[PDB]
Amino acid sequence: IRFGNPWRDDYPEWIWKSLRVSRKDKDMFAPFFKLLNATKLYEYCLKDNRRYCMFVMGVGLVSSWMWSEWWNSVWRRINKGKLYNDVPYVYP
C-alpha cells in the first residue's frame, strides 16, 4: 500500500497520465463569450466606472424586487391550504 505510507508513497500511473493530458487551443464555451460580446454591454455600461456604478445600483434595485416576489410565490404554492388566507373562518 502506497497511500499514506512514508515507506512507499507515490502517485499511481493513472494520475501521472491525467497530468499529461492536453487541451491546448480548445474552448468549448466560446459560443457563449461571442454572444455576450455582441450585446455591447461592455462599451455602454461597464467600461466607464461612473456608468458601471449606475449599472450596479440600478440592476440591484430591480433584481432584489423580482427575487422577493418570486420567493413569495414559491412559499404560497408549497404551503397551499395551511396559510391564513387559504381557509376562510366560518362563524357559528
Binding site: 467600461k47 466607464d48 466606472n49 461612473r50
Partner: protein, 462 residues
Amino acid sequence: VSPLARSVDAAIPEEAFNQPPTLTTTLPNGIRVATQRLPFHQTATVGVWIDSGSRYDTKETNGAAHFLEHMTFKGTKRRSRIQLEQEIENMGAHLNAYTSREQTVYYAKAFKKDIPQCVDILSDILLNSTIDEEAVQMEKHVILREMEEVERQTEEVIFDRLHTTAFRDSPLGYTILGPEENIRNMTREHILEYINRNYTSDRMVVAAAGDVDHKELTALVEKHFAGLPQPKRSKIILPTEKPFFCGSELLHRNDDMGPTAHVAVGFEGVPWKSPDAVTFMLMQAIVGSYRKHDEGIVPGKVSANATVRNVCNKMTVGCADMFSAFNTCYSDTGLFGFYAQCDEVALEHCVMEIMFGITSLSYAVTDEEVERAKAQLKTQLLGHLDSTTAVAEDIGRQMLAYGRRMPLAEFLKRLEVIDAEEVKRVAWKYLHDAEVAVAGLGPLFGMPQLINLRRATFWLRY
C-alpha cells in the same frame, strides 16, 4: 479695435506649399524610381529600399537576412573585396547598409558626377554577389562577437525582449541577429534560399535626392537592374494573418550589475496606413522625454509637460534618470509605449507616474498640452529634413509604407485639425483598459506586478 487683436495669424507658412515635387516612375519590370531635386546642393544620396527583413526568415534559419548583409560586401564576379573597397575610397564616396524586421536599406553618398558609378556598384552587389562557402565560415567569428557587444547596449536588448514576449506567435517577434546555434550552423544554401524568395522586382524602390535628374536615373536603373527576377504566383491568393498581441512580462533579475534598472512597456498600436496614425504621433509627443543630466534651460520642476513635472517633483528629489516615449508602425500592426532608467528604490514610483500620463490622454488632457506637443513635433520632424540622406530615407520609407510620398502641406493640414477631444476619442478606443507587455533588466525587487500595470490603464475616479 485694440492692436492686440490684429496680429498676423498665418497657420501654415507659404514655404510649405512652394516645395519641389517628388517625381515617380514605374518601369516595365516593376521597379519604382522616385527623385526630388534640391538645387542648393552639390552632393547627392542614392540608394535601394527593399521590402524584406528578419520577419521573412524561416524559423529554422532565423538570421540569414542579417547574414546576407555582411556577405554583400565580400565580393562579386567582377569585383573582389579589395577592389570594391578601393573604388569607393578613390571617389571619396560612402556606402552604408542596415537591416530591420520589415525593411532593408543600401545607400551611397557622393558627388553628382560619380552617381552612375554608384548605381553600377549597388546593382552588382545586390544581384551578382558570390556567397563563397569559405567566407561564410569566416564571418561566423565576426558575427558571434557582435552578439556580445549588442548585449552591452541595454536599450537595444530591452526592445528586442519586448518584441519577443509581445509577438510570441508571429515572425514579427524574431530577433534580427538570430540564435547562436543558427549562426554556427549557417550555410550558403540557407542564404541563397532567402534571396530567391524575397528579393524580387515588386519589393524594391530606388530613390535619390540632391543635384539629381529624374530621366537619367530612370535610364541607369533600366540598364543595370534588368537581371532582376519577377514575382511568381502559383494561383495562391491567401491573406496574411495579423500578429496576435500577448499581454505578458519577461524580467531578468540581477543584483550584481549596479543600482540602475531598465524597463519598457508597450501597447498594441496601429499600422502605417491607419486613419489614426497621425494622432499616435502626437500622443507620443505629449508624453515626451526627459534626461536628468541634460535638462536644458527649462528646469524640469517648472516644465509645461505635466509628466516631466510630476516625475521631477517626486519625494522632492525626482524619480527618474531618463525616460522617453516611442511609437512604431508596421505593415499590419504597431507598438506604442515608453522606456526608462531609474534607481532601484525609485522604480515603482517612476513606472506608475508615466502610466498615469498615458491614461490622462483618455480623460483630462488640455488644449494647452496638445498645442505645446504640436509645436515640438513640427520643429523636430521638419528640422530633420536638411541633408540629402534624411530626405532620401523619407522618400524610400514612404514609398514602401504608403505607396506614395505625402507632401509637407498635407501632413500639416492633417495635424492642424487634431484637438483635445480627438485625442480623447482615439485613446479611449485603443489605450483605455487595454493589454500591456513588459520587459525589464537589473535590480527589480520593487517592480510592480503585471496586474498593477494592467489596471493602471483605467481610473476609478470618473
